[PDB]
Design a protein around this nucleic acid. Structure first.
Ligand SMILES: [Mg+2]
Ligand SMILES: [Mg+2]
Ligand SMILES: [Zn+2]
Lengths: 168, 203, 74, 820, 58, 52
RNA sequence: GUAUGUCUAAAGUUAUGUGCUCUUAUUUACUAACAAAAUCAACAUGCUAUUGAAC
RNA sequence: AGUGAUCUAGAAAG
């Protein structure tokens, strides 16, 4: 049958509601329904280095990795996930997790990247204050230097222009 | 944007591997440089064919004449002088008056000869021999324990697959010539069976 | 790279000759053309420049190629 | 074999024959190899066997230019000091023009991120950037390589040059400065086009009115003739020699600027692994290339006209002529060349000959090139687009006169400069035997017929201008208009490019691209579309194929699923919001009679039709035609002039309230007077040629190259079309009958909206993350669109379709519809 | 999607349930082994769990 | 003897190779420039001469 | 276009030395081979300047 | 004062 098949065959006795209830009773005993991680395909989000064997892993390399939902949530609301790969040379497990507040990632185990909810709420309020809000003689001495530099540039350029005429 | 000495050495070592038509590979090493800049750096400073040596008196005469015959056309003048252009412009003007980590990645990449899937293939071969030696050693332990397990033959990938120990697989006997081979045939049979008994008892 | 190789020798047709056909009816082998045929047996003075004053065996330099490039690149 | 395959696949592509999507870009690849290979061979042969231009030709060209610029008392452009008054305005115009590219893009590669970095640096630090630009102008003479790419336009590929961004800032400043100072110093005479003062349709209108207003032009009783010569200056840009260019430029600009320009052309050109130095010929992609092109064009103009007639056309330097005017009729009728203009490389000349002057020119030509066979009619270029009755009639005397006129003009310019050929020339004659005068300009095919030559003066629709004798204000000729065939092929290639690049994409994007293309065609050509039946056929096919892209996105071409309400309903009601031109009746006529003469519209073909017969409005009914725009603009601006003089006399403001009602009329619109940018826009000289030259610098250039909204104003208004499509589809209550609207349980449509009105897109963090692009527009997702129109997409009365029922529901699907 | 979430679909699970009811079929490798042995009463099914431990240690 | 083929585009085995392996004017131009230089001199001297 | 590979269940041994019950997606949701060439629709109808202690 | 001229249509794999 094709990929986009519309109908699947149900036996004539099939009650969907009883079937779901029976399958729910069954699901608590199946191995692969209760294992702690989901296998996924993902790209390496940043350049990283394995700590066991010093192998460099570039960004955008594809891996077969394990996804874990963590117990902790960002501001008790948003899901955080650990993402675990294994080093291509030495097969050692490298792990990193999402960082929703930064909209970024942070390293956990096996590797190194190349280059508190109350406190977070307070920091966010202060950040919003900076967002909405967005030495005197030293600045004046810098304005003096800037005005001198501006007016001298024309004489420098005119010296170059005359030099070009002399060279010609 | 200044070029460091380490970046120049990385570029030369990279061009030794990749040639002068794969600058995106060169720039994948030089972390702060683009391919465009790397091609510029090679073609105008680091290519060994470039002649940066001091001008002869004849060259100064030639350069001044060409600068009159082809005014401001410095890439053309340079191609005729067989020298870099910025050299010709400077000469014409004279006559008329943490980085260790990048190098580590560079050496690691450039001295890697294998590529990805060949590396995975030698890893696979290592794992296969590990499993084979596992079976062999386990069989030896069980043989010392006095329970003589037989070695498992490999599984046939397809129904007509061959075990090369059961038969001489496509036997092409030598065509019989004029000379009688019988005596040395029975001698060879003696040799082979002697070797078989020897490997049975001595290993 | 080792999956990606040139052809050292071509497959010999002697191998296909070694076993029999397996009865698949191909459309192009159905009957057709079943009978053989057989043979019988003043204003023009004011300007500076007025008059008052092939085949080659290289495809790329041929006049057709020059005209083609002037037509299709612009 | 490779070059043979390239030839064959190019022919298939330009025919419209079947070609694979990958094969098109493969052909682009092969052909760009072959073009670079041939250009390298040309450059090397120039170096080996020497320059095309002889020393004698060079010295006399230099003498002609010197004589002109001395007779004009031209003061050469100096180098700009840092004290120069207009420095910040010139630089801000340059940086705005540069930033306009990246304000409309999202595929920002490293070079184009570096571009915006340097642009914001420059906006922050004007003096620093001025100083940097000027020291580079004084000192820098070696430049980074230029990458070339080719753009697949399906009739022909076209080059695009990528210059280094840091160099590009300097070149943009120099281009702006040179065009400003050249307008201030009156370098370029009135005949050089495009101009800041005219959009291209207004150039065609002013050219036709100018022809009609020459004295005695239409009289033929004494055997007079009028001849109109159109030809391209072939290979003009690529034959520019750099030493001749440098010594020519030194007559008009400072030596530092001339040397900078000259060195900047002598650069390495790269494409993949191909590389060569450009040793000869102008690189069209340099930002100042338009200036070089027009000045070299002025050299060729002076060779064509001669010193005397050039001074006649331009007038005395202290009060020059406006375009096509003369200081008196005595100056006008002194010399046969009555009119000249050049649009880039296309020259246009009108010659008015006495009968004996024509005889003299013709017998000279026949003295050197006699024709005993009367073979001269063979290969005479003639306008296919008009009937045999009304195109040029190939009489012996007129054919020979036209060939003589060309044969005279071809001698006047050396082949080393430009390639003027008969195969790229059109020469129409108006005479006792020929009543029609024909030319093609800016994509408009024009045919002028005087009222005294019409056998019967009928009334006409839009697409026929009446030409007015300005002495009496009486109508005295008609100009019939069509779109040029190459412009029809360009439009077809554009729709074809949209169709190819739109595999498995959002439907509203396809609709938006179609809308942009259709609007750009209709707002440019306007009334010339009416009399152009091949374009109507192409339009119908294009709209059908655009709808077919949507239909094949939904894996079903079946008409009954997709009534006009699905496509033409506006976006805020969940439709695609397409604009229509294809639901017209197409004029039909006997093919033989139409080849021979103007048959008139005897019959009508059906255009696009749907069983749900609805009177969908057309785009054409909401655009004011150019004749009416230009006449209303003349009235409007004269009225404004009188109002301005009385306001000056009162010494009070000529008020907004006093010009309301005239606010959104005129070319340029009256609104342009009062925009806040008026004081900075005043210095942006040369903007129109700059906008047209962007095709050589930028991939995916704008379709509205011909008008600048800042300078011309908003020249169309399609707000009414939305209201009229809503009423045409039976009103809003009829439109929502096709939709899943009542499945929501909402009582009434009004007060409902799609966008969820979140504040995130106003966040400073979002601004930091998306600063490059403006984001007012919104697409409809394909699955939401399919679900919204599901009662009609999954209707019951399908032509065929296997009836299946969705699992554990009573919903029936009639066939397979994706995403539903 | 992958083999695993196809095999753990409701239809497949229901067919597994119906097969263990209608014919006694049960692929024990699908199911988690009992932690405490004594809750298992049949000699047949206890021996099958023993077989699972055997293939696991192999 | 056929030399070893060293490509500037390809390196199948990833060999680092010795770098050196990985790596007149027509008279008309002179005549043209000389003629234009003389024409310029004519222009200068003519405008200077009639400046009086 | 939702990769794919290996493994094992084998056989016992081949002879000698049912409850309750939440649900307005409260899902660890999974796949990317597919496509990317986006600009018509913009933008208001008229431009700003302000306060030092004490002898 | 009205004669007529009427294309389509969907499934798989990639
Ligand atoms: Mg694939
Ligand atoms: Mg495939
Ligand atoms: Zn490792």
């Amino acid at each position: 049958s094709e990929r986009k098949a519309i109908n699947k065959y149900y036996p004539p006795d099939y009650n969907p509601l009883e079937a779901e209830k029976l399958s729910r009773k069954m699901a608590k005993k199946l191995k692969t329904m209760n294992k702690s991680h989901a296998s996924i395909r993902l790209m390496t989000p940043f350049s990283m280095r394995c700590l066991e064997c010093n192998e460099y892993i570039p960004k955008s390399r594809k891996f077969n990795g394990k996804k874990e939902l963590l117990k902790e949530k960002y501001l008790d609301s948003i899901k955080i996930y650990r993402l675990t790969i294994s080093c291509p040379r030495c097969a050692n497990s490298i792990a990193f997790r999402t960082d929703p507040g930064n909209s970024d990632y942070v390293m956990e185990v096996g590797g190194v990247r190349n280059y508190s909810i109350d406190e977070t709420l307070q920091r966010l309020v202060r950040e919003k204050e900076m967002e909405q809000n967005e030495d005197k003689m030293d600045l004046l001495e810098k304005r003096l230097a800037k005005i001198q530099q501006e007016q001298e540039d024309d004489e420098e350029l005119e010296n170059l222009r005359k030099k070009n005429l002399e060279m010609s | 944007g200044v070029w460091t000495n380490v970046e120049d050495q990385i570029l030369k070592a990279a061009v030794q591997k990749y040639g002068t038509h794969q600058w995106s590979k060169v720039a994948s090493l030089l972390q702060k440089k683009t391919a465009r800049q790397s091609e510029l750096r090679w073609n105008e400073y680091l290519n060994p064919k470039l002649n940066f040596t001091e001008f002869s008196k004849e060259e100064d005469a030639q350069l001044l004449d060409l600068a009159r015959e082809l005014p401001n056309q410095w890439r053309t003048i340079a191609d005729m002088m067989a020298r870099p252009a910025q050299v010709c412009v400077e000469r014409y003007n004279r006559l008329l008056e943490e980085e260790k980590e990048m190098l580590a990645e560079a050496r690691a990449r450039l001295l890697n000869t294998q590529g990805k899937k060949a590396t995975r293939k030698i890893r696979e071969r290592m794992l296969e021999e590990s499993k084979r030696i596992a079976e062999l050693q386990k069989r030896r332990e069980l043989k010392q324990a006095g329970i003589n397990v037989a070695i498992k033959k490999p599984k046939k990938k397809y129904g007509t697959d061959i075990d090369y120990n059961e038969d001489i697989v496509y036997e092409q006997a030598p065509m019989p010539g004029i000379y009688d081979t019988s005596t040395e045939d029975r001698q060879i049979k003696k040799k082979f069976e002697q070797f078989e008994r020897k490997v049975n008892r001595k290993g | 790279t080792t999956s990606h190789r040139p052809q050292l020798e071509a497959r010999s047709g002697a191998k296909a000759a070694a076993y029999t056909p397996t009865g698949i009816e191909h459309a192009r082998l159905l009957p057709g053309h079943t009978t053989l045929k057989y043979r019988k047996f003043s204003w023009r003075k004011g300007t500076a420049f007025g008059r008052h004053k092939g085949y080659i065996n290289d495809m790329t330099k041929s006049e057709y190629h020059q005209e083609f490039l002037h037509k299709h690149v612009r | 074999a490779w070059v043979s395959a390239a030839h064959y696949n190019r022919e298939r592509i330009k025919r419209g024959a079947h070609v694979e999507k990958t094969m098109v870009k493969k052909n682009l690849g092969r052909l760009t190899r072959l073009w670079i290979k041939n250009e390298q061979e040309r450059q090397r042969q120039i170096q080996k066997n020497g320059p095309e231009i002889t020393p004698e030709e060079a010295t006399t060209i230099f003498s002609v230019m010197v004589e002109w610029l001395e007779s004009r008392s031209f003061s050469p452009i100096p180098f700009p000091p840092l004290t120069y008054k207009n420095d910040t305005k010139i630089l801000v115009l340059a940086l705005e023009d540069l930033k306009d590219v990246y304000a409309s893009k999202v595929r920002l590669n490293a070079s184009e991120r570096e571009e915006l970095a340097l642009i914001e640096e420059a906006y922050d630090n004007p003096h620093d950037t001025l100083n940097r630009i000027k020291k580079y102008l004084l000192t820098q003479r070696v430049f980074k390589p230029v990458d070339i790419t080719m753009m697949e336009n399906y009739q022909n590929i076209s080059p695009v040059y990528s210059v280094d961004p840091l160099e590009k800032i300097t070149d943009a400043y120099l281009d702006q400065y040179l065009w400003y100072e050249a307008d201030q110093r009156k370098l370029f005479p009135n005949w050089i086009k495009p101009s800041d003062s005219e959009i291209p349709p207004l150039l065609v209108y002013k050219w036709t009115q100018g022809i009609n207003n020459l004295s005695e032009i239409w009289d033929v009783s004494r055997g007079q003739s009028a001849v109109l010569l159109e030809t391209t200056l072939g290979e003009m840009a690529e034959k520019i020699d750099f030493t001749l260019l440098n010594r020519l430029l030194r007559l008009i600009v400072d030596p530092n600027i001339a040397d900078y320009i000259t060195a900047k052309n002598n650069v390495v050109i790269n494409f993949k692994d191909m590389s060569h130095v450009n040793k000869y010929g102008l690189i069209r992609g340099l930002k100042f290339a338009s200036f070089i092109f027009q000045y070299y064009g002025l050299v060729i103009d002076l060779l064509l006209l001669g010193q005397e007639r050039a001074t006649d056309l331009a007038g005395p330097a202290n009060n020059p002529n406006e375009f096509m005017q003369f200081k008196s009729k005595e100056v006008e009728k002194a010399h046969p060349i009555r009119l000249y203009t050049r649009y880039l490389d296309r020259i246009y000349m009108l010659f008015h000959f006495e009968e004996d002057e024509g005889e003299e020119l013709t017998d000279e030509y026949l003295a050197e090139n006699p024709d005993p066979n009367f073979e001269n009619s063979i290969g005479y270029n003639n306008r296919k687009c008009w009937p045999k009755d009304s195109r040029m009639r190939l009489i012996r005397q007129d054919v020979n006169l036209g060939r003589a006129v060309f044969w005279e003009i071809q001698s006047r310019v050396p082949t080393s400069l430009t390639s003027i050929k008969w195969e790229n020339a059109f020469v129409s004659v108006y005479s006792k035997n020929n009543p029609n005068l024909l030319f093609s300009m800016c994509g408009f095919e024009v045919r002028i017929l005087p009222r005294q030559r019409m056998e019967e003066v009928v009334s006409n629709d839009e697409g026929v201008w009446d030409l007015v004798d300005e002495r009496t204000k009486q109508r005295t000729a008609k100009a019939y208009l069509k779109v040029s065939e190459e412009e029809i092929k360009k439009f077809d290639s554009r729709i074809r490019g949209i169709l190819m690049a739109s595999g498995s994409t959002t439907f509203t994007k396809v609709a938006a691209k179609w809308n942009t293309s259709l609007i750009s065609l209709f707002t440019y050509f306007r009334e010339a579309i009416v009399a152009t039946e091949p374009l109507l056929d192409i339009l119908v096919k294009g709209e059908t194929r655009i709808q077919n892209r949507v239909k094949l996105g939904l894996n079903s071409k079946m008409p009954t699923r997709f009534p006009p309400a699905v496509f033409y309903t506006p976006k805020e009601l969940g439709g695609l919001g397409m604009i229509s031109a294809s639901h017209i009746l197409i004029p039909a006529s006997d093919l033989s009679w139409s080849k021979q003469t103007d048959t008139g519209i005897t019959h009508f073909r059906a255009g696009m039709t749907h069983e749900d017969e609805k009177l969908i409005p057309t785009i054409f009914r909401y655009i004011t035609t150019w004749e009416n725009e230009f006449l209303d603009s003349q009235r409007v601006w004269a009225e404004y002039a009188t109002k301005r003089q009385e306001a000056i006399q009162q010494n009070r403001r000529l008020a907004f309230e006093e010009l309301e009602g005239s606010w959104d009329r005129g070319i340029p619109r009256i609104s342009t007077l009062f925009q806040r940018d008026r004081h900075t826009l005043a210095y942006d000289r040369g903007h129109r040629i700059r906008r047209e030259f962007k095709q050589y610098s930028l991939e995916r250039n704008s379709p509205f190259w011909w008008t600048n909204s800042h300078h011309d104003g908003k020249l169309w208004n399609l707000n009414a079309y939305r209201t009229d499509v809503i009423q045409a589809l039976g009103g809003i209550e009829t439109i929502l009958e096709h939709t899943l609207f009542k499945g929501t349980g909402f009582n009434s449509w009004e007060g409902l909206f799609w966008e969820k009105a979140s504040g995130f897109e106003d966040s400073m963090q979002f601004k930091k993350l998306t600063h490059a692009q403006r984001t007012g527009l919104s697409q409809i997702p394909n699955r939401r669109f399919t679900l919204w129109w599901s009662p009609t997409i999954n209707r019951a009365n399908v032509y065929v379709g296997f009836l299946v029922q969705l699992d554990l529901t009573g919903i029936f699907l009639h066939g397979k519809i994706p995403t539903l | 999607s992958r083999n695993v979430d196809k095999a753990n679909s409701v239809l497949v699970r229901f067919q597994e349930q119906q097969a263990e009811s209608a014919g006694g079929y049960k692929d024990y490798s699908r199911y988690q082994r009992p932690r405490n042995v004594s809750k298992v009463k049949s000699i047949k099914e206890a021996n099958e769990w023993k077989r699972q431990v055997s293939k696991e240690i192999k | 003897k056929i030399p070893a083929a060293v490509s500037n585009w390809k390196n199948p085995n990833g060999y680092t190779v010795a770098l050196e392996r990985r790596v007149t004017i027509n008279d008309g131009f002179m005549k043209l420039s000389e003629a234009l230089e003389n024409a310029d001199k004519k222009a200068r001297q003519e405008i200077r001469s009639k400046m009086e």
